[PDB]
Chain length 108, copies 3
């Protein structure tokens, strides 16, 4: 009776609140993945810029060294790391998809 | 009978575990926001440092070239990018808020 | 009857919640992994930038010493003031793993 009506009301409430939180969680992890993508892009681009600067400086120094060795009678280690978050972002995508699969559809 | 009582007990258990997990989620997303802000700060600061190094070398190389040319005649290829996560962090805040207003307050019995 | 439906609906609720719970644990764990990786990469590249700046400083110093020697210039910071910022997310990662711990402790084991 009224215990059953109250139990059904509570079931509906739990379902609504859980689905709302589920949408919120989906959104949060999707934004986290997009932010990780942008972070990877920025970090890798700045690492490429640093490597390009080092290589350009080395090339110019070599050219100057050739010019100097011409007036004489002579013959003639920076490590940049690239960021790789591909697998982690794929796992995050699968997490978001499981959250998709976790929607609650009550029997009326 | 006992089945209705067990169902009410299980409802209470479900709501309690859900609210616990909800608080946990909120803390995790707030922490993700903090970490993303710190990452943005560090990345942009080191990008500005790289840009300053590049421009410094450019100015000095130009000065030396000008001297050699004064006796001889009568680095924008390095481009750094900045990090912007403001929209992502704001939507993370909104996620935390929607999680906040999702707590379950069950009708007792 | 509606009582049978209530029971099976409760089971469905608990199962979908535990599914989502595992999903969130995985999500925050991989977020922690990604944050550790970005910290490592950012700090390594900051060290690389600093090393480039310092080696350029020393090389330019030797060259200026030679030029001053040929000029008999007697007197002996900018590129040595290029200071990088290193990333420290330790507190955030610890908070994240304790969040994953609480999510572990939030699993639903229904009574029959």
């Amino acid at each position: 009776g009224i215990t059953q009506q109250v139990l059904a009301e509570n079931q509906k409430l739990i379902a609504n609140k859980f689905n709302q939180a589920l949408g919120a969680m989906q959104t949060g992890f999707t934004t986290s993945n997009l932010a990780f993508s942008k972070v990877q892009d920025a970090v890798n681009a700045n690492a490429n810029a640093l490597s390009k600067l080092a290589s350009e400086l080395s090339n110019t120094f070599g050219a100057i060294s050739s010019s100097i060795s011409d007036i004489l009678n002579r013959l003639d280690k920076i490590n940049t790391t690239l960021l790789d978050l591909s697998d982690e972002m794929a796992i995050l995508q699968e997490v978001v998809k499981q959250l998709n699969d976790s929607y609650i559809d009550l029997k009326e």
